[PDB]
Each structure stands twice: as structure tokens, then as C-alpha cells.
Amino acid sequence: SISPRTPPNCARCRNHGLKITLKGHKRYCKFRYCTCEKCRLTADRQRVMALQ
Numbered sequence: 001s002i003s004p005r006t007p008p009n010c011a012r013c014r015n016h017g018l019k020i021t022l023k024g025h026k027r028y029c030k031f032r033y034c035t036c037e038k039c040r041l042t043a044d045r046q047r048v049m050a051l052q
């Protein structure tokens with residue numbers, strides 16, 4: 001693996017106040033597909049389209 005530094009807990013569900021540890025989760029994230037502006041802002045934090 002080239003990413004041994006995984007993020008703690010799932011961020012999709014913390015947006016609402018969830019903490020599952022993201023261990024074998026994602027599909028288990030009640031927010032796995034949420035769309036609120038805190039779940040989109042999250043996926044946005046990881047993706048990078050412009051640098052400053």
C-alpha cells in the first residue's frame with residue numbers, strides 16, 4: 001500500500017456528528033451518499049483542482 005496514513009473515523013458521517021472510525025465503513029456511512037454542504041465540503045477537502 002502507498003497510503004499507510006489513513007484518516008481517523010469517517011468524515012462523511014462526522015458532518016452530522018457521527019464517529020464510526022471509518023474502519024470497513026464508507027458503504028456503511030449513513031452519509032455514504034449524503035449531499036449536505038458539509039459532506040460536499042469534505043469530499044472537496046480531499047480532492048484538489050486548484051493550488052495556491
Ligand SMILES: [Zn+2]
Nearest residue numbers: 010012013029
Ligand atoms: Zn461515515
Ligand SMILES: [Zn+2]
Nearest residue numbers: 015034036039
Ligand atoms: Zn452530509
